From Swiss-Prot, chain A:
Topology of this chain in the membrane: Single-pass type I membrane protein
Intrachain S-S bonds: 15-27
Organism: Chikungunya virus (strain 37997) (CHIKV)
Changes after translation: N-glycosylated.
Domain of life: Viruses
Glycosylated residues, chain numbering: 26
Function description: Class II viral fusion protein. Fusion activity is inactive as long as E1 is bound to E2 in mature virion. After virus attachment to target cell via host MXRA8 and endocytosis, acidification of the endosome induce dissociation of E1/E2 heterodimer and concomitant trimerization of the E1 subunits. This E1 trimer is fusion active, and promotes release of viral nucleocapsid in cytoplasm after endosome and viral membrane fusion. Efficient fusion requires the presence of cholesterol and sphingolipid in the target membrane.
Signal peptide residues on this chain, from the entry's feature table: none
UniProt subunit comment: Interacts with spike glycoprotein E2. The precursor of protein E3/E2 and E1 form a heterodimer shortly after synthesis. Processing of the precursor of protein E3/E2 into E2 and E3 results in a heterodimer of the spike glycoproteins E2 and E1. Spike at virion surface are constituted of three E2-E1 heterodimers. After target cell attachment and endocytosis, E1 change conformation to form homotrimers. Interacts with 6K protein. Interacts with host MXRA8; this interaction mediates virus entry. The interaction involves 2 adjacent E2-E1 heterodimers.
Name the record gives this protein: Spike glycoprotein E1
Full protein stretch here: 1054 to 1102 of 1248
Cellular compartments annotated: Virion membrane; Host cell membrane
Length: 49, 49
């Protein structure tokens, strides 16, 4: 009768919760480093540009 | 065929061991025929006779 503040409804930074399994989504803080390795096949020389 | 309007430029040079520079040159000749090309200093080398 007094569960009150659900973490679905009281999450800082607008995260959402989902159960089975527990998971918090969209925790908008920080910043992600992302790296990519790629070969020369997808590029093309300026002689085609 | 003698030529005029010598407009050479280099879009992308890379001092590698392969052909790392593709020099693009627009010209204006006198007539149609073969034409020899030659590098006069020893800093660079060419692959086309």
């Amino acid at each position: 009768k007094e569960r009150g503040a659900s973490l679905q409804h009281t999450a800082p930074f607008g995260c959402q919760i989902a159960t089975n399994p527990v998971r918090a989504v969209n925790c908008a803080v920080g910043n992600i480093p992302i790296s990519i390795d790629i070969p020369d096949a997808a590029f093309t020389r300026v002689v085609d540009a | 065929p003698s030529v005029t309007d010598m407009s050479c430029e280099v879009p992308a040079c890379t001092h590698s061991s392969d052909f790392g520079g593709v020099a693009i040159i627009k010209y204006t000749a006198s007539k149609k025929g073969k034409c020899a090309v030659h590098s006069m200093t020893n800093a660079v080398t060419i692959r086309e006779a």
